[PDB]
Design a protein around this motif. Structure first.
Motif, PDB file in Angstrom:
ATOM      1  N   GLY A   1      -6.390   4.303   5.172  1.00 32.57           N
ATOM      2  CA  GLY A   1      -5.800   5.642   5.137  1.00 32.57           C
ATOM      3  C   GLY A   1      -4.526   5.777   5.955  1.00 32.57           C
ATOM      4  N   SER A   2      -4.418   5.026   7.053  1.00 42.29           N
ATOM      5  CA  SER A   2      -3.190   5.012   7.837  1.00 42.29           C
ATOM      6  C   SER A   2      -2.119   4.161   7.165  1.00 42.29           C
ATOM      7  CB  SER A   2      -3.491   4.466   9.233  1.00 42.29           C
ATOM      8  OG  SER A   2      -4.310   5.349   9.980  1.00 42.29           O
ATOM      9  N   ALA A   3      -2.522   3.063   6.517  1.00 42.13           N
ATOM     10  CA  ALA A   3      -1.590   2.084   5.966  1.00 42.13           C
ATOM     11  C   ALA A   3      -0.843   2.576   4.728  1.00 42.13           C
ATOM     12  CB  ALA A   3      -2.369   0.813   5.630  1.00 42.13           C
ATOM     13  N   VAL A   4      -1.340   3.599   4.015  1.00 41.52           N
ATOM     14  CA  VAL A   4      -0.665   4.140   2.821  1.00 41.52           C
ATOM     15  C   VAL A   4       0.401   5.189   3.135  1.00 41.52           C
ATOM     16  CG1 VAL A   4      -2.675   3.681   1.342  1.00 41.52           C
ATOM     17  CG2 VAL A   4      -2.416   5.961   2.415  1.00 41.52           C
ATOM     18  N   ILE A   5       0.472   5.658   4.382  1.00 46.25           N
ATOM     19  CA  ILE A   5       1.461   6.635   4.841  1.00 46.25           C
ATOM     20  C   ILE A   5       2.758   5.934   5.244  1.00 46.25           C
ATOM     21  CG2 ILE A   5       1.903   8.426   6.548  1.00 46.25           C
ATOM     22  CD1 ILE A   5      -1.180   8.758   6.730  1.00 46.25           C
TER      23      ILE A   5
ATOM     24  N   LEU B   1       0.735  -1.261   0.000  1.00 47.16           N
ATOM     25  CA  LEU B   1       0.000   0.000   0.000  1.00 47.16           C
ATOM     26  C   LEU B   1       0.775   1.331   0.000  1.00 47.16           C
ATOM     27  CD1 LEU B   1      -2.841  -1.224   2.371  1.00 47.16           C
ATOM     28  CD2 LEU B   1      -3.096  -0.672  -0.033  1.00 47.16           C
ATOM     29  N   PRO B   2       2.099   1.440   0.233  1.00 50.91           N
ATOM     30  CA  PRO B   2       2.719   2.785   0.217  1.00 50.91           C
ATOM     31  C   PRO B   2       2.389   3.569  -1.045  1.00 50.91           C
ATOM     32  CG  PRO B   2       4.265   1.250   1.143  1.00 50.91           C
ATOM     33  CD  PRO B   2       3.075   0.413   0.667  1.00 50.91           C
ATOM     34  N   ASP B   3       1.978   4.822  -0.847  1.00 53.97           N
ATOM     35  CA  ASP B   3       1.706   5.786  -1.922  1.00 53.97           C
ATOM     36  C   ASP B   3       0.393   5.513  -2.678  1.00 53.97           C
ATOM     37  OD1 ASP B   3       4.005   7.378  -1.368  1.00 53.97           O
ATOM     38  OD2 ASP B   3       5.225   6.213  -2.795  1.00 53.97           O
ATOM     39  N   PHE B   4      -0.368   4.467  -2.334  1.00 52.35           N
ATOM     40  CA  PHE B   4      -1.713   4.320  -2.888  1.00 52.35           C
ATOM     41  C   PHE B   4      -2.610   5.438  -2.343  1.00 52.35           C
ATOM     42  CE2 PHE B   4      -0.439   0.200  -4.377  1.00 52.35           C
ATOM     43  CZ  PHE B   4      -1.404  -0.263  -5.237  1.00 52.35           C
TER      44      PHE B   4
ATOM     45  N   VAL C   1      -6.744   6.249  -1.330  1.00 50.36           N
ATOM     46  CA  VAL C   1      -7.935   5.542  -0.826  1.00 50.36           C
ATOM     47  C   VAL C   1      -9.111   6.526  -0.832  1.00 50.36           C
ATOM     48  CG1 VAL C   1      -8.900   4.278   1.123  1.00 50.36           C
ATOM     49  CG2 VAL C   1      -6.407   4.171   0.673  1.00 50.36           C
ATOM     50  N   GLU C   2     -10.217   6.166  -1.501  1.00 51.32           N
ATOM     51  CA  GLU C   2     -11.347   7.080  -1.677  1.00 51.32           C
ATOM     52  C   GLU C   2     -12.672   6.313  -1.765  1.00 51.32           C
ATOM     53  OE1 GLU C   2      -9.206   8.305  -5.629  1.00 51.32           O
ATOM     54  OE2 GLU C   2     -10.786   9.793  -5.194  1.00 51.32           O
ATOM     55  N   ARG C   3     -13.762   6.956  -1.319  1.00 53.78           N
ATOM     56  CA  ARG C   3     -15.108   6.460  -1.597  1.00 53.78           C
ATOM     57  C   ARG C   3     -15.328   6.385  -3.107  1.00 53.78           C
ATOM     58  NH1 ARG C   3     -19.711   4.239  -1.972  1.00 53.78           N
ATOM     59  NH2 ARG C   3     -21.543   5.206  -0.998  1.00 53.78           N
ATOM     60  N   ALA C   4     -16.116   5.382  -3.564  1.00 51.93           N
ATOM     61  CA  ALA C   4     -16.369   5.156  -5.006  1.00 51.93           C
ATOM     62  C   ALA C   4     -17.886   5.130  -5.336  1.00 51.93           C
ATOM     63  CB  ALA C   4     -15.657   3.909  -5.516  1.00 51.93           C
TER      64      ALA C   4
ATOM     65  N   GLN D   1     -20.972   0.953   8.296  1.00 50.57           N
ATOM     66  CA  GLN D   1     -20.133   0.828   9.472  1.00 50.57           C
ATOM     67  C   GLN D   1     -18.828   0.098   9.135  1.00 50.57           C
ATOM     68  OE1 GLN D   1     -23.576   0.038   9.263  1.00 50.57           O
ATOM     69  NE2 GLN D   1     -24.453   1.715  10.488  1.00 50.57           N
ATOM     70  N   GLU D   2     -18.927  -1.058   8.464  1.00 48.53           N
ATOM     71  CA  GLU D   2     -17.734  -1.818   8.048  1.00 48.53           C
ATOM     72  C   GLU D   2     -16.911  -1.024   7.032  1.00 48.53           C
ATOM     73  OE1 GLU D   2     -18.089  -6.018   7.068  1.00 48.53           O
ATOM     74  OE2 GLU D   2     -19.637  -6.350   8.603  1.00 48.53           O
ATOM     75  N   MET D   3     -17.572  -0.359   6.076  1.00 47.00           N
ATOM     76  CA  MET D   3     -16.856   0.475   5.109  1.00 47.00           C
ATOM     77  C   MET D   3     -15.992   1.495   5.843  1.00 47.00           C
ATOM     78  SD  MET D   3     -18.299   3.062   2.131  1.00 47.00           S
ATOM     79  CE  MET D   3     -18.668   4.308   3.347  1.00 47.00           C
ATOM     80  N   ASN D   4     -16.576   2.144   6.856  1.00 43.12           N
ATOM     81  CA  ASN D   4     -15.850   3.175   7.591  1.00 43.12           C
ATOM     82  C   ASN D   4     -14.614   2.629   8.320  1.00 43.12           C
ATOM     83  OD1 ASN D   4     -17.496   5.288   6.752  1.00 43.12           O
ATOM     84  ND2 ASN D   4     -18.621   5.432   8.691  1.00 43.12           N
ATOM     85  N   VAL D   5     -14.689   1.421   8.887  1.00 49.82           N
ATOM     86  CA  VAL D   5     -13.500   0.828   9.505  1.00 49.82           C
ATOM     87  C   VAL D   5     -12.381   0.687   8.467  1.00 49.82           C
ATOM     88  CG1 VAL D   5     -12.544  -1.127  10.820  1.00 49.82           C
ATOM     89  CG2 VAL D   5     -14.792  -0.242  11.420  1.00 49.82           C
ATOM     90  N   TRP D   6     -12.696   0.146   7.265  1.00 52.41           N
ATOM     91  CA  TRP D   6     -11.706  -0.019   6.191  1.00 52.41           C
ATOM     92  C   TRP D   6     -11.112   1.321   5.750  1.00 52.41           C
ATOM     93  CZ3 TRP D   6      -9.286  -4.380   5.197  1.00 52.41           C
ATOM     94  CH2 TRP D   6      -9.921  -5.598   5.488  1.00 52.41           C
ATOM     95  N   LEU D   7     -11.953   2.341   5.551  1.00 51.91           N
ATOM     96  CA  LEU D   7     -11.414   3.651   5.172  1.00 51.91           C
ATOM     97  C   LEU D   7     -10.455   4.176   6.249  1.00 51.91           C
ATOM     98  CD1 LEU D   7     -14.709   5.289   3.767  1.00 51.91           C
ATOM     99  CD2 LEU D   7     -12.823   4.452   2.379  1.00 51.91           C
TER     100      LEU D   7
END
Length: 101
Positions: free
Chosen positions: A95-99, A50-53, A55-58, A85-91
């Protein structure tokens, strides 16, 4: 694992207007994402680092609760959760994992 759960994944090149997406068991560990055919499979069907990916709602997808992860040298992937609710956990977690440093 930092997160796990069921997610639908859009077929590569498939229309945004289709609701026929395959369901995988998905695991996030550090900065890597893995998708397995079921909860007992030893080997994943795919992964991405995931670095530099981004992440956005679609909302362009007909499938409800969909989101997009994209990188210009690798690929763009579309996933969807069963509910908001589950979508929000993934977002939250992706979002932390791409930094990185």
């Amino acid at each position: 694992a930092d997160c796990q759960g069921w997610l639908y994944k859009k077929k590569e090149k498939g229309s945004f207007l289709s609701n026929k997406w395959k369901k995988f068991w998905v695991i996030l560990k550090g900065s890597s994402l893995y998708w397995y055919s079921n909860q007992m499979a030893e080997k994943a069907d795919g992964f991405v680092n995931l670095p530099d990916f981004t992440v956005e709602r679609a909302s362009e997808c007909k499938k409800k609760h969909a989101f997009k992860i994209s990188h210009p040298q690798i690929k763009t992937f579309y996933f969807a959760a069963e509910n908001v609710q589950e979508m929000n956990v993934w977002l939250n977690k992706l979002g932390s994992a791409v930094i990185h440093q």
